[model samples]
Target: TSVITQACPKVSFEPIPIHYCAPAGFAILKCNNKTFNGTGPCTNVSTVQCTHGIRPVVSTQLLLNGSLAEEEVVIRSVNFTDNAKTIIVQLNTSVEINCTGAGHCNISRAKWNNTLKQIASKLREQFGNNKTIIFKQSSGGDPEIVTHSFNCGGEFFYCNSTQLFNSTWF
Candidate 1:
């Protein structure tokens, strides 16, 4: 704040600056002169490397609890650059239906809305409230903006799957 001098200023906590931190789908690279898997602790400036690329294309999947019921994918070939760096990862989300034999039952957009309301009712009875039922609601975007915890020691490091999550539909 006091006449910022560093090329990469340390992020402030409160009174944060505009888009001051790294965004999701950020470019990863090898930071030479330092051992690292990719250069990070980035900013809006780093976004220069990702000015544009494969934009979002809604790819929705209808699911009955945990089984694939129906799908719609308007996918464009995923290709990125910056010397083969990683970028643009989309979330493959599904609409969980409450029954079996899936989409054949019905999967119109209208039906999708009906399903959501019905789910609220079902959960309402069990939990005395539908508070636990939260859908894929992300304002920013899916695979959306997230603040990742990094190992300051740096070097393309990743923590192995700490929690193994699995599920199956009824």
Candidate 2:
């Protein structure tokens, strides 16, 4: 077989069109690098299916210590699950988290913990790449409350919050 003659660019950007994001025979066709595919960021690969384009997750359910903190949450950016050091990015001012076994604790909505979080980044790097996402921190109860979950669909993996979700002091 040969290249599709119709609508094919005359080798403008790059040569030999094989991938979607590549500058190949077709015109400028790209997908959103921010748009996640449930697990991670989706490739900016233009295909027959993603005809026009795709969009990133604008909102999500904030799960605090395996409980629901808020709904329809919007922020600057966010990385998908399963990352060694996963990250969550909210705006300068956002919602205050409220999670407890009695209110919105699901006890299995997340498998992550606060230890894996690196909420802050470098000054120059944060400005250059727009990676300024701030996780809330406050001094309240006896022990600090730990937050560790934020999926693309607000759905989680397994149940393991046996005592973690019980933020009920000693």
Lowest summed lDDT across 10 adjacent residues in model 1 is found at 161-170
> Candidate 1 at residue 155, lDDT?
21
| Candidate 1: segments with Cα more than 4 A from true spot | 1-107, 124-136, 139-170
lDDT over C-alpha atoms for residue 22 of model 2: 30
The TM-scores, one per candidate, come to 0.19, 0.22
TM-score of 2: 0.22
Best by lDDT: 2
Best by TM-score: 2
- Model 1: residue 4 alpha-carbon error in angstroms: 38
**Candidate 2 deviant stretches above 4 angstroms:** 1-44, 51-102, 106-111, 114-116, 119-134, 137-170
Which digits, one per residue and each the tens of the lDDT, describe model 1 over residues 1-170?
Answer: 57866686555323212222335766543223221212346233222432323322222321122211133111112232342432321113454322222212223556445444443443312323434544442233323122111222222112221111121111
Model 1 RMSD in Å is: 20.5
lDDT of 2: 0.33
Per-residue lDDT for 39 in model 1?
36
